[PDB]
A paper describes a structure:
In total, 181,714 particles were used for auto-refinement, yielding a final reconstruction of [name] map at an overall resolution of 3.4 Å. The model of 3D classification displayed a 2-fold but not 4-fold symmetric assembly at the cytoplasmic domain (CPD). Two pairs of diagonal subunits sharing the same conformation are named as Mol I/I’ and Mol II/II’. The pore domain of [name] displays a closed inner gate, with its narrowest constriction formed by I285. In Mol I/I’, the helices B’ and C’ of these two C-linkers are pushed into a relatively “straight” helix. By contrast, the helices B’ and C’ from C-linkers of Mol II and II’ exhibit a “kinked” conformation. In our study, loops1/1’ stack against “straight” C-linkers of [name] and might affect the downward movement of S4. The two “straight” C-linkers may sterically restrict the conformational change of the neighboring C-linkers, thus inhibiting the opening of the pore. These structural findings may underlie the low-activity of [name] in the basal state. In addition, four phospholipids are built surrounding the pore helices of [name].
The voltage-gated [name] is responsible for primary K+ uptake in Arabidopsis roots. [name] is functionally activated through phosphorylation and negatively regulated by a potassium channel α-subunit AtKC1. [name] is the first characterized hyperpolarization-activated voltage-dependent K+ channel in [name], which belongs to the Shaker K+ channel family. Each subunit can be divided into four parts: the transmembrane segments comprising S1–S6 and the pore loop; the C-linker which contains the helices A’B’C’D’; and the CNBD.
Numbering used by the authors:
A (entry chain C), C (entry chain A): 6 to 14, 48 to 510
B (entry chain B), D (entry chain D): 49 to 510
The structure:
């Protein structure tokens, strides 16, 4: 019960802290300009002081960014190194985006000087600064410290808010830039717009955009002339896909999060209900559920370890195995006095594994393929040669399992049952023979083996007698 | 001192849940539609506050479970000094009677009454507990939680929107003032119904057209309300999709399993005499729920040792009743029962053919079978075999083609043990082989059926 | 290319035909009454001739069904047999549903005779006949001949249509049963209802119900008084969940249908793009994609066969194996002259398998565990003992593979490579020894083996020479 | 006779696609808004009809692919007798000019012009072909097909609804007559725009309120229209959900793989010196797309024989350039290259440590590495090793602790050969061991680095 509950539960680097803390500051300005540019494009025809001053400030900041970005190295994809070549940095920045960044920094006063018909379509050029938020969202998605669900939710919220704002600004622009204002969507409802506060018109247009996007459609503020009808047709066509995309993303976030818990939940629910019904055992039913809980943990760790390995080079896997098991392997009785390099080679190919309690790692009278070594827990040696399952000896962490059968090429002697959650490490017979063959120190192993057979009475002696007869 | 899980405390929590629901409904209503204590309701508010005061004084005497506690921590400190440091002040400010707050200030009625919403932690904890239960489905309580939060959102939005309408001078030029002439001179029931109708119309994205925002404050509120509505609707649709996907997998799995089996049968061009039988067996396996496939899907995941004990416990009383195993041993029977395979057979099917090669002998557990013998086109019934009886054992022990065809009558569950495995086990324990042989010999005493068998064997028995 | 395209591409039984063709006929009457009862409950207060006559006819038909169902046996869940016991049939029908079926058959004239205030709520009792459509849908879902997608779509369509009809009838009933008709949802729009055609009122109410369900909400025909507001509140509250359920079902039908296409699609897309890029081979890249196509077919069939088997009793699996392989194994050279029963026992435990072309079923110098037999295709015998991969002999369908190593308990002789899609069947060494031990016919096998060693020159002879000294 | 896949025929089909789109747009428009041939458009209709007549007379000369055909069937019969028996009559009735149908009857203009919609089989076949392509995504063409059918449904509904409005006497008391005073006395453009606006408003479930059905015919049509709309919206949402689910699995897989690796590293309490390296390796392997993980995910699924030939072809020119293998053999090199493991290393890392146990020697394929030697805290660069060169071979062949630390400069791909495997391979072919040894000995002639090694080995070489 307790276990089951637990289971359920002067250039600069592009990575400097002083540069990352400043690049992220430009996201605030990107948000500000993304809000301002459609509002200025729709509701304003001439630069007003309280907005023009801030626009000039932001343009100066982005010009500072442009003049600074020439001193920032990048990471080559074919080298994974900082380029640190001012010749290459400039010829990459110019080819990637330099004129687009430049045109998005000219103050609106200069645009008006060129032509008064401008300053509407010129402010929309400042939307080019929206690549920074996309790059930031990509980095956040490819980052571990930030939750995927909240990142996706924030991205969706930003997208829908920007769409609402842009649509509202465009639709109010269509309303205002029209003779006979009484024949417009807002002129047929208020009948006195272009005279009251800008805040009222902004909130009215935003309310219309929100009602149209969420498909509420109250009925006030509806298109009258043909241009508004066409724009609203296209807007609703976009909104259908936008809502479908939002629903799909929400479904995707809702699923695959609790999905991998449900396999465990139902595979244990079947066991629990089968135990509860059909002559419920007193305590055996409690034993089996703990075994299932341990197995679900064992295979997951046995798979995560297998997944993270076999994808790394041998040079680092060998180092990891040496860090984990070389110290423990020094206590192995067979490898006593052998050359030190052979120990390293053996450790580098040990293939650690895990086993649930009451599991038969080796069964009696089987083909000799592998020999095991204990790391954690303990196991009991049993044999059915006498007709009964009686234990012979208990092996603790630090002894070999079934080494007699593999060395002498004969079927195993005793069935090994792990009375506890045991971590083992097994290496094949063919690999052992290959390693021994490409070496000169191998007599010590057989001397240690034969010495060990003497310490056990009459169980190995028959095998020892056979080996002595077979050696001659 | 009392411990959790007690039937005098869980019932008390379940009773406090309905009071929490009452508070969650009432507090926004008094915040929006009410100004004075309104004795029609302040007495009930005081009653609920007294009940929650009883709870807050009672909670000092209840234990809890820590990360590694022994299922209970029954002391004064470490529970009094834990509760006071988590939410004591919030649970105390949210139970002060509204009558007292009037003396402090007369304009804080609704604002102070909205503090009672802190009691929703009870509902949150209940939903969290039901999420990790066994008798209740997971997605079916997730959807209930979504429905509850949707209803709460609708009620809160309606109350806030009517508050915005009422707290504005010149009641005309408002969402309710433009439709209803003088709403302020009408019953509270109809105004509440109208506000709730508007809230539901906005939430379900119907938007009939009546009761729409007029001034800027209502538009500003409604924009955020609609954004929250879109988010909530998307989340609810996702949860419903997950519930549907994970709530009908059994039928799809059965369908695709049967389709794959039929494709396999067709690929090798098996005769229909086999296809019908395998289809019937598979339909029986995937139709009997919690007994047919459950036993296999459970015992398969055991490491041949725990399931051995399971079969020993589940098949010992029936095993000891057979005549073949009378006085063999108390561990040989353990090995025997651990070396059996459980099988099921649909009715009107034969498990043993007459004059077949003797390879298996069965032990009946449930149901009945008829020992059908044929002389010349006559399926004369010899006798009926009941539960807890052995069949087909005389052909495998005494090597000979099978005597009688065993056709099943009802839905039966059989235990099958291989001849080779039984011979290997018997050869390993020769001492019980004599017991088995004499038990078989003494049983062969019925009318003229095995009489020649004893004599024929005695020819080679010297 | 071609292979890849192919891979992508007087009682009666309750099962009598004359009874199934009549029970399905009652579904038409169930649909008719499911349409009529809400319409009669809302739009009609007294039994009109053209509807009362048909209602009496349908009631007579259902009374005939009631009086006939006493002569139909059922299938017991604990027996899976037709009960055929008229004593038990009646005591099951009465306990399950007899009074509910009876009350849903009384003609409406009798209900009016009891009280004129009735005949509204009495017609809604006829909705009890909706269990038949539910049972039919369950049977269709549990049936193979009918597509799951279309059954689910039809069920959803029926549910939503019934909801629309019931809501429309209830809402028109609320409108009509009210004094001062000018203060109703339909009285404020038409202002002359209760006087024009019933068809107009029915279609108007249905149009309102459809507009409310699909969340269009044009604006005409909206609630006015409090009762209509409450009913509409509850109706839209139900509609939200109904639409969520429909969307969830549609998503579930859309996914899991093309899902198991995409694993193959992307696992072959990766291979195709890797072959196209990075020094595309002339024809080797064509060879590997065919191997992947064959493997995707091989493991699928190898899994479907494994899934359908191991779930059936041994008595039928043995019969299937005997039908498939007993005739073929008669040609096996080792089992010539052995007792016939031993052949049956061997056939019962052969565990047939499949292998893609250019696959090594047995590799040289491995532990002797299994020996194989060919069924289809052919394989080539290769050995690296000479330092090169040179074929020695080609084995056709009907010969054993690696039988020398398993019998003599020595490492295998030659690596076996399947030059074509080969179906094999392998059985273990321990099983073979157990089968041989529980028998008396075994000398024939070893004599046949030794005779076979003489037909091959100097390759088995060294092993045969060792065996001659090993036997002594 | 011409065969499919020809660039003079596929282009022709792609050009007919836009004509099919034009017909699909125009035919409902003329059915609804038009009565007479309207020469402003009948000339274009006749042009398109002539083009489709050219196509229908041309299709007698194009082959096809059957179930087991040899990619083409170029005859007169079995293609003429197949096309004439499948859709010849439909493709001929759907190309008769509308001028001819006027003589038959003047009231069948729109009904006969609606028969041109049969040409949508071209778009259907195009979408089916694009579904089973390689350069185009599957869900991204499914969504395009859904968008196209949604647009077609909107257009058809708008045309039908305006036809219903116009074909009714007393134009007032209609959905457009109640809003627009005299719609029949206004331009076709504005009427079409209004009808399309109503159709889009109904489809997106906005329902502003203007242009609503008045009489019973419009209500009856609109009920079925809304039901179809609900079905189409549900299907489109399902398809979009499937696209989203199957379009972002790569990022989730990378995230969960990195999370699992970090959990494994933390569980065993590895030092950071290993955690950073393994995280860098995993990020590099999951970041390099189409070259890093693609090679492993491809070669892993090969049965050790085809991938052997792949490595033989991909690693023979570079292998033959090494000084160690000059005149060794033409099959031993095949075995060696088939017995190599491909590995990748991020820059600024060391693959061989100085004075380590000699166990592997590498062959560089791409990138550069620096042979770093340290005397006393001085990482003096000895020399740079380029692509197609062997490293660390002097320590494994001549058993000795490694001489120089090989630190990588760029992103490199290496081939690793195990000392034990190489020794076993060499021992199997002794005649080439002499060649390998003398090739090694002759190379040992640089300045003072291996001079003592040659002498020291010659001490034991007698
Ligand atoms: C019928 C015909 C078709 C109709 C339309 C069909 C649906 C189109 C959906 C388009 C979705 C685009 C999208 O999701 O973009 C993501 C990237 O967004 C981004 O990169 C968004 C960046 C941020 C944009 C907003 C920035 C300002 C936010 C704050 C605004 C404040 C003022 C206004 C309130 C992709 O992402 P992926 O990962 O799928 O690839
Ligand atoms: C662009 C779009 C932007 C959207 C922004 C807004 C997003 C809103 C998201 C709402 C999430 C709600 C939530 O947390 O639900 C579960 C928790 O529910 C709970 O914790 C349940 C709380 C229930 C409280 C009320 C209970 C009923 C009270 C009585 C009501 C009586 C009404 C009478 C009319 C999640 O849970 P999980 O899935 O994370 O786990
Ligand atoms: C209660 C609810 C009841 C609902 C009842 C109605 C259900 C409607 C279902 C519609 C399914 C449509 C469909 O078959 O779509 C795919 C096939 O599309 C196709 O075959 C594509 C056909 C496209 C034809 C039009 C192409 C564009 C023509 C030019 C338009 C120009 C417009 C200009 C404004 C499916 O395919 P699958 O997924 O089964 O495979
Ligand atoms: K809507
Ligand atoms: K709406
Ligand atoms: K509306």
């Amino acid at each position: 019960l307790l276990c089951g509950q637990v289971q359920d539960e002067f250039v600069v680097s592009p990575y400097d802290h002083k540069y990352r803390i400043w690049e992220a500051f430009l996201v605030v300005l990107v948000v500000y300009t993304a809000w301002v540019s459609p509002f200025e494009f729709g509701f304003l025809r001439k630069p007003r002081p309280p907005l023009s001053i801030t626009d000039n400030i932001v343009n100066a900041f982005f010009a500072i960014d442009i003049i600074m970005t020439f001193f920032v190295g990048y990471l080559d994809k074919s080298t994974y190194l900082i380029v640190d070549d001012r010749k290459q940095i400039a010829f990459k920045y110019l080819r990637s985006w330099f004129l687009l960044d430049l045109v998005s920094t000219i103050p609106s006063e200069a645009a008006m000087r060129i032509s008064s018909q401008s300053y509407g379509l010129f402010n929309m050029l400042r939307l080019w600064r929206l690549r920074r938020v996309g790059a930031l969202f990509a980095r956040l998605e490819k980052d571990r410290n930030f939750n995927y669900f909240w990142v996706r939710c924030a991205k969706l919220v930003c997208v829908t808010l920007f769409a609402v704002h842009c649509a509202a600004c465009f639709y109010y622009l269509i309303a205002a830039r029209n003779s006979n204002p009484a024949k417009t969507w807002i002129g047929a409802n208020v009948a006195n717009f272009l005279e009251e506060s800008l805040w009222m018109r902004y909130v009215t247009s935003m309310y219309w955009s929100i009602t149209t996007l969420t498909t509420v459609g109250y009925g006030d503020l509806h298109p009258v002339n043909t241009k508004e009808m066409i724009f609203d047709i296209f807007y609703m066509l976009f909104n259908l896909g936008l809502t479908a995309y939002l629903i799909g993303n929400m479904t995707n976030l809702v699923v695959h999060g609790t999905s991998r818990t449900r396999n465990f939940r139902d595979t244990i629910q079947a066991a629990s209900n089968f135990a509860h019904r059909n002559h419920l055992p007193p305590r055996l039913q409690d034993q089996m559920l703990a075994h299932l809980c341990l197995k679900y943990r064992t295979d997951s760790e046995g798979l995560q370890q297998q997944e993270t390995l076999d994808a790394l080079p041998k040079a680092i896997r060998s180092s990891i195995s040496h860090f984990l098991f070389y110290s423990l392997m020094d206590k192995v009785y067979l490898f006593r006095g052998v050359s030190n390099d052979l120990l390293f080679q053996l450790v580098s190919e040990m293939k650690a594994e895990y086993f649930p309690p009451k599991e038969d790692v080796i069964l009696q009278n089987e083909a000799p393929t592998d020999f095991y070594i204990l790391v954690n827990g303990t196991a009991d040696l049993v044999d059915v040669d006498t007709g009964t399952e009686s234990i012979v000896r208990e092996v603790k962490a630090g002894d070999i399992i079934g080494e007699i059968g593999v060395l002498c090429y004969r079927p195993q002697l005793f069935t090994v049952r792990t009375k506890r959650l045991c971590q083992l490490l097994r290496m094949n017979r063919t690999t052992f023979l290959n390693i021994i063959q490409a070496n000169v120190g191998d007599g010590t192993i057989i001397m240690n083996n034969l010495l060990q057979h003497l310490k056990e009475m009459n169980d190995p002696v028959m095998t020892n007698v056979l080996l002595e007869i077979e050696n001659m």
